[PDB]
Amino acid sequence: QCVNLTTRTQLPPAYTNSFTRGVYYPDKVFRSSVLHSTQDLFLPFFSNVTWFHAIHVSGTNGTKRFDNPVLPFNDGVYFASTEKSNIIRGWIFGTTLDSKTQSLLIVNNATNVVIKVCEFQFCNDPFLGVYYHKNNKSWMESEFRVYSSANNCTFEYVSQPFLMDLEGKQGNFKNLREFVFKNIDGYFKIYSKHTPINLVRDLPQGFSALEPLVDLPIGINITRFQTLLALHRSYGWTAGAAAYYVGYLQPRTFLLKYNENGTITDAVDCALDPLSETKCTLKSFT
């Protein structure tokens, strides 16, 4: 039953530099340990990324300012998260997301994942909900309520969960999830990377490459995506200051380095700085 409780006030926009985030593995092996220029779209380095609060944390508690704005998707999305509890466990893609154009839905289970395309009739509030199930049964949703109804589900798919939580997080290390969502040709591609972080709430300096998870053939156009989170009915939504960062990809981050094992340890962006363009031209880092 679609119950609406979200407020109607915007959040004061926040920004922060990416610090080189958004480089992922293209194609097959390259163990040369030598540069390999590529022409593919990534997230440009040192480009500031917004910072949305799913449950706006203001005052004594953030639960009084529920807010999950609908964000445009554009060419591609870099989605970064650090929420302790999996309040955000879903995703929605589409051009209008209103009972038309065969919108796309993705949902994550506690032990699985389901992707579907049923031309959903989305309810005005994209939530899921969770309930208690009477005898000898713990919290679990009786029914999804992301959308009013599903229509013919042209594409179906089920598999193991994308998000991993088996890692033992302590008071120092908190998991950070990064996802690159792209839609090229007839293929929707998701490149994910999970890694602990402890330095700060922001993204620490360093390097890391996102391996591909799946490559779903979906013949749909994506313009606006609204991060879907299974609002936990803590009658009465709640979240441990859940927040997510959204960046928009651009078609230039070219040079890619490799190490002995075959990992992308470092990379360069030719259009960032004149020095970087010089480094690209010589095909050398120094």
């Epitope: 509890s85 309930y131 208690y132 199930h133 009477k134 005898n135 000898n136 713990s138 919290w139 009786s142 936990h232 803590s234 009658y235 709640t238």
Partner: antibody, heavy 128, light 113 residues
Framework: QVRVVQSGAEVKNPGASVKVSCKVS????????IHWVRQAPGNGLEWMGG????????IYAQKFQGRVTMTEDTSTDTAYMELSSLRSDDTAVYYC?????????????????????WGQGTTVTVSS | DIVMTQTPLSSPVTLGQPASISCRSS???????????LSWLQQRPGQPPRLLIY???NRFSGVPDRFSGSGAGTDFTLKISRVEAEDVGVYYC?????????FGQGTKLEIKR
């Protein structure tokens, strides 16, 4: 906020089956467990039926045992108790309440409200 | 069986004075969780019993500042600062400690006349 709704009245005879309804709104019936509890006009409540959270089923009263069953549907969320051989102890407003368990995101601890929410209630009449 | 019985049957009282009811028990009401539990229901004339408290520590939603927990041992007490007219109906004292849920006969509240 929590509310409860119930039936209006019943007209029966001794030694015959009767059916009395109950429902928990505000907090869905799933959020708690209904205890079918009965009383006379201004009398103590008899624990005719208790939906034990531990057992997840209705247990009957010792005073009036061997006199009741139940029938419930989940799609329509309609819960009825099929009692029998009502009395003046039953000839009153049937108030049904539910015991709820409240916990944070984890299941650290479960409360037992016993009887959290109450409704208008159902009457009963027994005539020879 | 915890024998619950409210000693008084009627309570005519003049406005502006603390008043309460005793609720004796044959055996102790201590709960396995280690915290005691109490319950009080107020039934206004021709009205459903409104749960005054599901727990003495945490009273039910919509209880006047008058009603406050108190008592001596087995006897309980709903202390009142200044009595109000609406409380002129039946009263019930309940314990949610045990599964049988045995109740007393009940008490009626009236206006002095």
């Amino acid at each position: 906020q929590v509310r409860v709704v119930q039936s209006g009245a019943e007209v029966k005879n001794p030694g015959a089956s009767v059916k009395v309804s109950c429902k928990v709104s505000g907090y869905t019936l799933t959020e708690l467990s209904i205890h079918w509890v009965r009383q006379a006009p201004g009398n103590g409540l008899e624990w005719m039926g208790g939906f034990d959270p531990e057992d997840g089923e209705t247990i009957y009263a010792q005073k009036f045992q061997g006199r009741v069953t139940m029938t419930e549907d989940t799609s329509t969320d309609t819960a009825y108790m099929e009692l029998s051989s009502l009395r003046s102890d039953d000839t009153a407003v049937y108030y049904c309440a539910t015991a709820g368990a409240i916990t944070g995101t984890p299941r650290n601890f479960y409360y037992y409200y016993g009887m959290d929410v109450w409704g208008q209630g159902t009457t009963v009449t027994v005539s020879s | 069986d915890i024998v619950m019985t409210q000693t008084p049957l009627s309570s005519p009282v003049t406005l502006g004075q603390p008043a309460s009811i005793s609720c004796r028990s044959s055996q102790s009401l201590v709960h396995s969780d280690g915290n005691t539990y109490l319950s009080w229901l107020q039934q206004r004339p021709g009205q459903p019993p409104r749960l005054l408290i599901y727990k003495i520590s945490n009273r039910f939603s919509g209880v006047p500042d008058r009603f406050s927990g108190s008592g001596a041992g087995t006897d309980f007490t709903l202390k009142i600062s200044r009595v109000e007219a609406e409380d002129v109906g039946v009263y019930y004292c309940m314990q949610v400690t045990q599964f049988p849920y045995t109740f007393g006969q009940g008490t009626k509240l009236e206006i002095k006349r």
